[PDB]
Amino acid sequence: SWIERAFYKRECVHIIPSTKDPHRCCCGRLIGQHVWSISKHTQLSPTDAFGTIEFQGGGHSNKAMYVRVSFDTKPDLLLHLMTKEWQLELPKLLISVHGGLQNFELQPKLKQVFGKGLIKAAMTTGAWIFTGGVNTGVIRHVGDALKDHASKSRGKICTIGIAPWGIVENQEDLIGRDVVRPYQTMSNPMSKLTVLNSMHSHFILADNGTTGKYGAEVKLRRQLEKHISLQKINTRIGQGVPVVALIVEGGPNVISIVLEYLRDTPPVPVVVCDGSGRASDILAFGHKYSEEGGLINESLRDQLLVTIQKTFTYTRTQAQHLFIILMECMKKKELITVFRMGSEGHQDIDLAILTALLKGANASAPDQLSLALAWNRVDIARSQIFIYGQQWPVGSLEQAMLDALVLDRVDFVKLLIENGVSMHRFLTISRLEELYNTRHGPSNTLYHLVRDVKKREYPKGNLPPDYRISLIDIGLVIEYLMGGAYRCNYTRKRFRTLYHNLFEINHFPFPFHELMVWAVLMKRQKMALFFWQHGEEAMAKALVACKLCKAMAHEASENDMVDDISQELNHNSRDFGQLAVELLDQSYKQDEQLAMKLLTYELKNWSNATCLQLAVAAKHRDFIAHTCSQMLLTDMWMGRLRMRKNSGLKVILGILLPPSILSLEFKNKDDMPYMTQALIPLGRKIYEFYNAPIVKFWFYTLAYIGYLMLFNYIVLVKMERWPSTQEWIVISYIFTLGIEKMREILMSEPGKLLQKVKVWLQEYWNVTDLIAILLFSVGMILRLQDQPFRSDGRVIYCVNIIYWYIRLLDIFGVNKYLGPYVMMIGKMMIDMMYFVIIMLVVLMSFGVARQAILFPNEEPSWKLAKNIFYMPYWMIYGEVFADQIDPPCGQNEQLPPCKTGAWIVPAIMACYLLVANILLVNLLIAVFNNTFFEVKSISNQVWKFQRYQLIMTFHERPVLPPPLIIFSHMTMIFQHLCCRWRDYGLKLFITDDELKKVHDFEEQCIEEYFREKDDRFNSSNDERIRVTSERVENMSMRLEEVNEREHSMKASLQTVDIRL
Amino acid sequence: NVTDLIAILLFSVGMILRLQDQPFRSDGRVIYCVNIIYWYIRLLDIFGVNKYLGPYVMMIGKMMIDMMYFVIIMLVVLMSFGVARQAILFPNEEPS
Amino acid sequence: ITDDELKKVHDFEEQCIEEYFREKDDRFNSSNDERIRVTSERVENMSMRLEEVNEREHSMKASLQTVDIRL
Ligand SMILES: CC(C)CCC[C@@H](C)[C@H]1CC[C@H]2[C@@H]3CC=C4C[C@@H](OC(=O)CCC(=O)O)CC[C@]4(C)[C@H]3CC[C@]12C
Ligand SMILES: CC(C)CCC[C@@H](C)[C@H]1CC[C@H]2[C@@H]3CC=C4C[C@@H](OC(=O)CCC(=O)O)CC[C@]4(C)[C@H]3CC[C@]12C
Ligand SMILES: CC(C)CCC[C@@H](C)[C@H]1CC[C@H]2[C@@H]3CC=C4C[C@@H](OC(=O)CCC(=O)O)CC[C@]4(C)[C@H]3CC[C@]12C
Ligand SMILES: CC(C)CCC[C@@H](C)[C@H]1CC[C@H]2[C@@H]3CC=C4C[C@@H](OC(=O)CCC(=O)O)CC[C@]4(C)[C@H]3CC[C@]12C
Ligand SMILES: CC(C)CCC[C@@H](C)[C@H]1CC[C@H]2[C@@H]3CC=C4C[C@@H](OC(=O)CCC(=O)O)CC[C@]4(C)[C@H]3CC[C@]12C
Ligand SMILES: CC(C)CCC[C@@H](C)[C@H]1CC[C@H]2[C@@H]3CC=C4C[C@@H](OC(=O)CCC(=O)O)CC[C@]4(C)[C@H]3CC[C@]12C
Ligand SMILES: CC(C)CCC[C@@H](C)[C@H]1CC[C@H]2[C@@H]3CC=C4C[C@@H](OC(=O)CCC(=O)O)CC[C@]4(C)[C@H]3CC[C@]12C
Ligand SMILES: CC(C)CCC[C@@H](C)[C@H]1CC[C@H]2[C@@H]3CC=C4C[C@@H](OC(=O)CCC(=O)O)CC[C@]4(C)[C@H]3CC[C@]12C
Ligand SMILES: CC(C)CCC[C@@H](C)[C@H]1CC[C@H]2[C@@H]3CC=C4C[C@@H](OC(=O)CCC(=O)O)CC[C@]4(C)[C@H]3CC[C@]12C
């Protein structure tokens, strides 16, 4: 409704002057067909012709919006229509295509080159194409180019055409108000009126009142182009949008339009094409034969006059006037870029167009760089802005670096860095908070994270819209997303002190770390992959990025956001994990010991952590299952012991015989010092042996086996009123194990006790241990009383011995073959459960039927439910109860009489036994068999992942086994009281030179991986085939041109031989 | 649906036999036991809704044909051994 | 649905149809077999055209030799 109330229209209410034809008025319409003010006396009214046009026919179906406007309307209102009602963003480039209104045909290769150029130019910059609207001549060529574009590309080219309203065929067909109107692409050759072009996007059909006459649109199009060019571009460096003027063929008027474009403030560059003919060819012949602009000698002046008089069929004075207008154009010869087919005329439309825009702007190179940044054309920037000898202002390159960063232009970062711009000198604290607070580029979820951590920190709520996200808030986001005891460098007291005292000290020592974190947080994947290559600590950066992407994917799924976001962040997490795995593979291929040093050393920039800890916290199964991590974990397992030959027996012999300890080959003092917080050799050997995790595990295993044997003795032998010595040892083991599990609860990661309890009950073995310890205390309390509670305590003791015998599988989980077997059993338990369900259905059907037939007169008693399940369950395991299948009855051998329907019981027994024993057992065999391989590979990888958890658990465990652990517990309470009265991991703590060689080894591995990946991509079959096919294409077109030039040279040689 | 119709007709026959006196009441009880076999089997319709139990049930239905062919070959071998054992160990038998 | 929702549903269907069709065309044109066939055929036309170019080059060399002999 706004279009009718804002735009106006004019209709022909005149005195009907006949002039030549009595029906034809001044407006050209029929004399009875009626219903500027000079001789038309036109009246103004709201519009009645606007909406959408459905182009019926002409191949592809395409919808184009349209509106009928007055020719005298102000262009700001029209612009506002395009920006608001048609939802068109402000273009980064305006193209004005002018040419002859008569239809013409060009060369096929010229038409193909011009069409491909116009399509690519309007695609890559997102331009607006301004045509004549109707389907005549150059606009017909533009429509054919857009037809080829619709036939082979994803683009929607905004190709707004402006035509007069009076000349378009079927004017009554386009009458409506926000109504879709079908249109016919057929044009009657008898009618002088022409149809609109089918492949246009918008129409600004302008009515001056007259019909069948031009000139109603040129002024309006010119003021709209000017008004667009006064609008500032989004770079906000101080320039408007650039305007180019493409000229194909043309008539006598297009020289005047070229003059009007050149003699304008600001000037507009003009690109012409050669080979079409008419005004373009005379412009080209003027441009090549021009010398110093307007300095044209007499002979080519007369040649230009005779070509104007011959091609344009003009008189002598008309040709002289056109030559005067030509010279007035040629005064500004620098603005005209002439494209020539073949030769060295840029071999392309678009290089000519874009460099014409570049030197028509004629500004400083920062303005040119901001233009190329807005157009997303790194190729033209590299080829012409960054040419040799280009002067650059101080500080402009860093401003363009910032602008390329905030707009997500990765290749522009690459070009600016290659040019020389360095992150160390560019990155400041202020620039990075500006980067975190940008609004350009793709969408992101970071405002939700900062809102959640602000709600959690100060329980406010929703942030203000004009909120500047500080780096402290970003640090809190890293703390929450990483989880655990991670402490980001922003939240430390040093950076908060620097932030309070300031809002090379403000420069970042590792700027690529901050750029990596910024890129992953604001969901810019290509930027993060670019920043991963550059800088040190690549594997740490990859694992941190993997954890960040996984945890933001989880948080986005938790806040009920778009699921496509969560899928993309999971894909980014899997990509960063795959990078980390390939880096580990490269480091393992180069040097094993440097790879372990890379995996183990403390990362001061990542909360004092370890690459192994970061991989475990990211739950990266493939990282720990890699051979290098497995051998590092094996080295961590043996502690300070070389050994590594017939393991198990030597450490058992050392535990049982203490003088066997000193006959062992111990490791060096500084061979691989994995530490948590950074007679004498005999004592050092004793202390180094007894703190090894393998030694602690075997001591724990021997104590558990001895306790299990004592429990077996106290349940098999009878017990007296008071417990024996063996039962006291078993009770002591249970109590000290419970105290040890309580100490594991208290020495955990969270602060609030319910969170520690929840994170400790997240393991199934811990909750079953707690249930067993409570069951033992209940049974012991019942046993210490008199009868009949002592037998109940004995029964609870038997249930507990079932549990501890099952818990031997925890000890069995350490072996390389038994552990995967155990979790494989755990995987097959689900298929067992489904089998148990179907067995349950069939079993109770047979049980209910058998019991209800064979026992008709029964009272309500719970023995019926027992008889339901009793014999049919044992029928599965080879006991069919053959004496009770069909006993002889109703005869004398006096037997009791036959129950009615007792013969049914063997028949349904036969059906039940067949179904159960032959169907469901064999089906469960099939389910166990066909899911074995996936389950087996998964259990192997999961066991190799949980080796780390086992090693850390046994390293953090006390030296003494549980039955003697009360002495070590008293040692820690005494030490804790002494520390009160007066960092969980195994890092290496290298020096600075070792850090230097580790970093250089990491850079060598990064370059090796990257351009080995490039070598594999370049030597693959698909890439070779594609490359060969494309070079065959260029070869065939060039050889066709060579054949044409060879024919021309043969004709010239024949003429020269005929002459001489 | 056809098994449901057969079961409902069987229940009405058994209930009609049960509402009389002896010996038809025991026959109605026997028909009730055959029907409880059927409804216990028809729990698999409710089980067909779960994402894992449903495919399991129709998978069982697919393997029933291979069971039938096994039952045929077992039937041939089983009656060969049964006829041979009974006809050797019991030479003097009346038609029964 | 209403009529406007029918309109956006129909336009979404047309977008999906064009996406499927000329993505299928892109997959057909970037496949290895089609590339190999295209390269072989353009090598055929290239070889016959280069044989014609060699014949015309021999004729042009003979004409240039005759013109040099004349002058
Ligand atoms: C390190 C692992 C692999 C083995 C450690 C366990 C054994 C050294 C323990 C566990 C069970 C113990 C037995 C449990 C019960 C008894 C009965 C006990 O006899 C009595 O209690 C009645 C007579 C008396 O009081 O001496 C004599 C010791 C003995 C054989 C114990 C001997 C030592 C055993 C074999
Ligand atoms: C640390 C635990 C988990 C296993 C370690 C094994 C041994 C240190 C234990 C297990 C069985 C124990 C034996 C179990 C029973 C007895 C009988 C016991 O006889 C008496 O006490 C008789 C006199 C009395 O009735 O008081 C003397 C200790 C002895 C040999 C124990 C000595 C220590 C043994 C060998
Ligand atoms: C004396 C009678 C009552 C026999 C006892 C039978 C059950 C109480 C036991 C026998 C085998 C046990 C299972 C053997 C192996 C495993 C894998 C293990 O689980 C894991 O290692 C976790 C990983 C995973 O589940 O895959 C411990 C649970 C489970 C299912 C056990 C659960 C308890 C089970 C079913
Ligand atoms: C479908 C399959 C995989 C599982 C279904 C079978 C079980 C649920 C059944 C089969 C045997 C049943 C047991 C058979 C006998 C008894 C003894 C009964 O105790 C008595 O009768 C008291 C002592 C007596 O009177 O002799 C209590 C139920 C119980 C444990 C039954 C509990 C249910 C059991 C374990
Ligand atoms: C108490 C005694 C007599 C045991 C009863 C034995 C049979 C009457 C039952 C036991 C298992 C049943 C089968 C379990 C599973 C299926 C699949 C289900 O069929 C479908 O879901 C249709 C699709 C398909 O057939 O694959 C119902 C029929 C069938 C063959 C059942 C037919 C009846 C069976 C053979
Ligand atoms: C789909 C499947 C899982 C259904 C399984 C149903 C049966 C196994 C249950 C359901 C109702 C139960 C009955 C509910 C009530 C009683 C009465 C009860 O009587 C007494 O305890 C005596 C009363 C007294 O003297 O206090 C004996 C068990 C019994 C027959 C139960 C036996 C087992 C039944 C038949
Ligand atoms: C669902 C699957 C995965 C697990 C199987 C669960 C049930 C089939 C079991 C678990 C608990 C069992 C019940 C536990 C205790 C009893 C009491 C028991 O009573 C007696 O034996 C009374 C003594 C007598 O008179 O003999 C009869 C069986 C019954 C109902 C059991 C029937 C079978 C039940 C329901
Ligand atoms: C090849 C396999 C898969 C199937 C072949 C086996 C069945 C067809 C057989 C095996 C057991 C047979 C049953 C064994 C015993 C009897 C009891 C019989 O009734 C009596 O003898 C009346 C009571 C009495 O005299 O004790 C009726 C036949 C029947 C149901 C038989 C019917 C045929 C059955 C089910
Ligand atoms: C290829 C396979 C499937 C062939 C299987 C053949 C046998 C299982 C059948 C076929 C003929 C049957 C016999 C046909 C006739 C009789 C007489 C019949 O006698 C009576 O009923 C008594 C007569 C009266 O007093 O009324 C007892 C069963 C019997 C032996 C049948 C027993 C079972 C037989 C041997």
Q: What is the 3-state secondary structure (H, E, C) of A884-928?
A: HCCCCCCCCCCCCCCCCCCCHHHHHHHHHHHHHHHHHHHHHHHHH
Q: Distance from CA of residue A108 to its chain's centroid?
A: 43
Amino acid identity at A732: S
Task: Determine the straight-line distance between the first and last CA of chain B, rounded to whole angstroms.
Answer: 40
Round to whole Å and give the CA distance between A854 and A228: 98
Q: Length of chain B in residues, anyone? A: 96
Among C32, C42, C63, whose Cβ lies nearest the Cβ of A1025?
Answer: C32
Which tokens in the block code for residue A757? Answer: 């309890």
Q: Do residue B43 and residue A837 have CB atoms under 8 angstroms apart? A: no
- Across the interface, do C42 and A1033 touch by the CB < 8 Å criterion? yes
Structure tokens at A514: 């901050």
Q: Which residues pair with A180 in a beta bridge?
A: A52
Spatial separation of the C-alpha atoms in residues A930 and A829, rounded to whole Å:
15
Please answer whether residues A101 and A137 qualify as being in contact, where contact means their C-beta atoms are separated by less than 8 angstroms: yes
What amino acid is encoded at A540 in this protein? Answer: A
Task: Give the closest residue to A385 by CA, choosing from A395, A370, A404, A403.
Answer: A370
- The Cα A831–Cα A415 span in angstroms is 58
Cα distance between residue A659 and residue B24, in whole Å: 88
Question: What is the distance between the alpha carbons of residues A633 and A951, in angstroms, rounded to a whole number?
Answer: 8
Q: Among A911, A920, A922, which residue has the most ligand 5 atoms within 8 Å of its CB, making it the best to mutate?
A: A911
The CA-based diameter of chain C, rounded to the nearest angstrom, is 89
Interface test with C, best of A1025, A1041, A1045, A1048 (most C CBs within 10 A): A1025
In this structure, what DSSP letter does residue A88 have? P
CA distance A124 to A377: 7
Q: C-alpha distances in angstroms, A139 versus A170, A176, A250, A278?
A: 19, 26, 12, 16
Cβ within 8 Å of residue A242, ≥6 positions away: A93, A94, A229, A357, A360, A361, A371
Nearest CA to ligand 8 atom 7: A910
B38 vs B5: CA distance, rounded Å: 12
**d(Cα A706, Cα A954) in Å, to the nearest integer?**
19
Burial class (CB in 10 A: 0-12, 13-18, 19+), A676: exposed
Q: Do C60 and A1053 touch (CB under 8 A)?
A: yes
CA angle B43, B48, B49 (to 5 degrees): 115
Q: To which residue do tokens 């043996």 refer?
A: A638
Q: In chain A, after which residues does the backbone break, taking C–N over 2.5 angstroms as a break?
A: 35, 459, 503, 678, 893, 982
Answer whether B65 contacts ligand 5 (Cβ < 6 A): no
C40 touches chain A (CB under 8 A): no
DSSP label at A510? S
Q: Answer yes or no: is the C-beta of A822 below 6 A from any ligand 3 atom.
A: yes
Summary count for chain A: helices (H), strands (E): 42, 13
**Whole-number Cα distances in Å, A372 to A136, A354, A404, A885, A946:** 33, 9, 10, 93, 52
Amino acid at A10: R
Chain CA centroid to CA A523, Å: 7
The resolution, in angstroms to one decimal, equals: 3.2
- In degrees, rounded to 5, the angle at the alpha carbon of residue A104 between the alpha carbons of residues A102 and A108 is 160
Inter-chain CB pairs, A–C, below 8 Å: 56
**Helix or strand run (H / E) with residue A614:** helix A611-617
Cβ distance of C36 and A152 shorter than 8 Å: no
Q: Token match 């045929």: residue?
A: B72
Chain A: closest CA distance from residue C9 (Å): 15
> Count of CB atoms within 10 A of residue A505's CB?
7
Q: For A866, what's the count of Cα atoms within 13 Å in the CB-facing half-sphere?
A: 4
Which chains sit next to C, with 3 or more Cβ pairs under 8 A?
A
Indicate the length of chain A as a whole number: 1060
* Chain B contact partners (≥3 CB pairs within 8 A): A
Tallying the residues shown for chain C, one arrives at 71
Task: Give which of A400, A607, A386, A407 is closest to A526, Cα–Cα.
Answer: A407
**Which residues, in sequence order, are CB contacts of A744 under 8 Å at separation 6+?**
A760
Half-sphere exposure of A586 (CA within 13 A, CB side): 21
Number of other CB atoms surrounding residue A115 within 10 Å: 20
